[PDB]
Design a binder for this molecule. Structure first.
Ligand SMILES: *[C@@H]1O[C@H](CO)[C@@H](O[C@@H]2O[C@H](CO)[C@@H](O[C@@H]3O[C@H](CO)[C@@H](O[C@@H]4O[C@H](CO)[C@@H](O[C@H]5O[C@H](CO)[C@@H](O[C@H]6O[C@H](CO)[C@@H](O)[C@H](O)[C@@H]6O)[C@H](O)[C@@H]5O)[C@H](O)[C@@H]4O)[C@H](O)[C@@H]3O)[C@H](O)[C@H]2NC(C)=O)[C@H](O)[C@H]1NC(C)=O
Ligand SMILES: *[C@@H]1O[C@H](CO)[C@@H](O[C@@H]2O[C@H](CO)[C@@H](O[C@@H]3O[C@H](CO[C@@H]4O[C@H](CO)[C@@H](O)[C@H](O)[C@@H]4O)[C@@H](O[C@H]4O[C@H](CO)[C@@H](O)[C@H](O)[C@@H]4O)[C@H](O)[C@@H]3O)[C@H](O)[C@H]2NC(C)=O)[C@H](O)[C@H]1NC(C)=O
Ligand SMILES: *[C@@H]1O[C@H](CO)[C@@H](O[C@@H]2O[C@H](CO)[C@@H](O)[C@H](O)[C@H]2NC(C)=O)[C@H](O)[C@H]1NC(C)=O
Ligand SMILES: OC[C@@H](O)[C@@H](O)[C@H](O)[C@@H](O)CO
Ligand SMILES: OC[C@@H](O)[C@@H](O)[C@H](O)[C@@H](O)CO
Ligand SMILES: [Fe+3]
Ligand SMILES: [Zn+2]
Ligand SMILES: [Zn+2]
Length: 341
């Protein structure tokens, strides 16, 4: 069967995909859509084979028959004996971040402040935190908790999009793809670094990766970790070094999905593609790297050591686990077992 069609979300991911396609000698081809959801539709239709998804979307795709294939693994300290591809995934820490200078801002006084989310329907940027705020608040009016937000994917005319900037010309305001200045882990963090928002719902990795000269991007150049605090569920505020005892939840790694009838074929190609363009791939540093895109998290997260086999041939509910799956189901009662499309 041997040729995989990859689905890219928006213009910037399309261009990296074209490049990956070039260096692979057409072993991988690209289809493009303006949103993650449209990419999932394309995969159902059969017009694209696979894409990498945040847990939040895996839940969506899952209800539609798509299955996780391989997962992103970042370099861990424990489980050092095992090779990255066979090594179990650790998941990541959802956290809520704020400016240290913004004193007296805690989890208990988040109401009527300004929020930065990765995008609607994502784990750390939306489901985890809006899940908690609904339960704590006993109201489904999560669109009225924060005074203004940037929540890519929500109604552009709503308060949930008020803080989103769109692209260089200010078009595509709020679109849930990287054309939005404030989309995804980085976008949401920039949203805070620039004091557009009061809080940012991202992952622990995002604060480290974009502070203390890790980014060299113009807006992160001068960001110091020491100027940021984590918000914990007990009302306290801790340094970004204490993420292990001050997070909202641990989230299942982003995974590659596909139609079940296609999983095997997607898997074999992807494993070979990474032996060539992964971290120590034949042709990475020299010609092309699947896992670099200058802090921009295009196609895969920049901190991916490798894509890993799953083991236990899990179904999407097992991959995400019971915990998270009930969090999303509960939260989706505000916004009924069927494919969204
Ligand atoms: C929040 O997010 C940030 C960013 O994602 C993250 O910080 C990053 O953490 C990773 C790993 O978790 C760091 O990676 C390390 O970086 C070093 C050099 O900078 C790399 O080079 C080496 O790798 C070696 C091989 O893995 C490693 O040796 C290993 O083996 C020794 C055995 O002798 C052992 O060390 C001893 O000490 C431990 C601890 O007390 C002891 O228990 C052991 O028995 C042992 O004797 C360890 O097993 C060790 O892993 C070298 O030590 C050396 O580190 C390497 O890749 C390494 O993984 C990144 O640098 C961090 N990123 C940035 C930008 O700073 C946080 O971890 C996240 N926090 C939370 C809470 O998750
Ligand atoms: C928002 O609010 C809702 C409302 O509470 C939250 O939803 C609840 O989440 C709970 C935690 O996920 C969940 O609790 C239940 O936990 C029991 C016990 O968990 C067990 O732990 C064992 C460890 O010894 C483990 O071995 C077990 O496998 C098990 O996980 C679960 O077990 C029940 O089912 C049995 C049926 O055979 C029954 O006999 C037994 O008595 C238990 O009741 C249970 O399945 C469940 O996980 C609870 O289910 C959720 N409530 C609802 C409405 O479903 C959300 O999580 C909140 N959102 C956020 C983000 O926090
Ligand atoms: C395109 O895909 C084909 C199919 O695997 C690759 O051709 C094989 O490459 C392996 C090692 O790379 C050889 O050992 C096989 O004998 C080849 N034959 C097959 C299986 O057809 C090819 O390498 C791929 N090209 C790129 C650049 O990824
Ligand atoms: O990201 C989910 C992960 O693949 C899951 O299978 C865990 O690894 C397992 O429950 C314990 O490690
Ligand atoms: O990410 C954790 C994982 O999803 C786990 O909870 C599995 O569901 C369970 O261990 C196997 O059934
Ligand atoms: Fe995520
Ligand atoms: Zn925890
Ligand atoms: Zn199973």
């Amino acid at each position: 069967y041997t040729r995989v069609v990859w689905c890219a979300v928006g213009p910037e991911e399309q261009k990296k995909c074209q490049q990956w396609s070039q260096q692979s000698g057409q072993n991988v081809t690209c289809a493009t859509a303006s949103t993650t959801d449209d990419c999932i539709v394309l995969v159902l239709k059969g017009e694209a084979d696979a894409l990498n998804l945040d847990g939040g979307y895996i839940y969506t795709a899952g209800k539609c028959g798509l299955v996780p294939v391989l997962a992103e693994n970042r370099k861990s300290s424990k489980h050092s004996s095992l090779d990255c591809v066979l090594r179990p995934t650790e998941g990541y820490l959802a956290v809520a971040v704020v400016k240290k200078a913004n004193e007296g801002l805690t989890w208990n006084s988040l109401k009527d402040k300004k929020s930065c989310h990765t995008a609607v329907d994502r784990t750390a940027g939306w489901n985890i935190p809006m899940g908690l705020i609904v339960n704590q608040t006993g109201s489904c009016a999560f669109d009225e908790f924060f005074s203004q937000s940037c929540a890519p994917g929500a109604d552009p005319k709503s308060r949930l999009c008020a803080l989103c900037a769109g692209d260089d010309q200010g078009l595509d305001k709020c679109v849930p793809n990287s054309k939005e200045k404030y989309y995804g882990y980085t976008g949401a963090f920039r949203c805070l670094a620039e004091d557009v928002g009061d809080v940012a719902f991202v992952k622990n990795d995002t604060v480290w990766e974009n502070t203390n000269g890790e980014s060299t991007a113009d807006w992160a150049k001068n960001l110091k970790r020491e100027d940021f605090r984590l918000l914990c569920l007990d009302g306290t505020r801790k340094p970004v070094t204490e993420a292990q005892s001050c997070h909202l939840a641990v989230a299942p790694n982003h995974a590659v999905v596909s139609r079940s009838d296609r999983a095997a074929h997607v898997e074999q190609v992807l494993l070979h593609q990474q032996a060539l363009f992964g971290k120590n791939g034949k042709n990475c540093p020299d010609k092309f790297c699947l896992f670099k895109s200058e802090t921009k998290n295009l196609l895969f997260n920049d901190n991916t050591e490798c894509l890993a086999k799953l083991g236990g041939r899990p179904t999407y509910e097992e991959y995400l686990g019971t915990e998270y799956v009930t969090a999303i189901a509960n939260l989706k009662k505000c916004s009924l077992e069927a494919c969204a499309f």
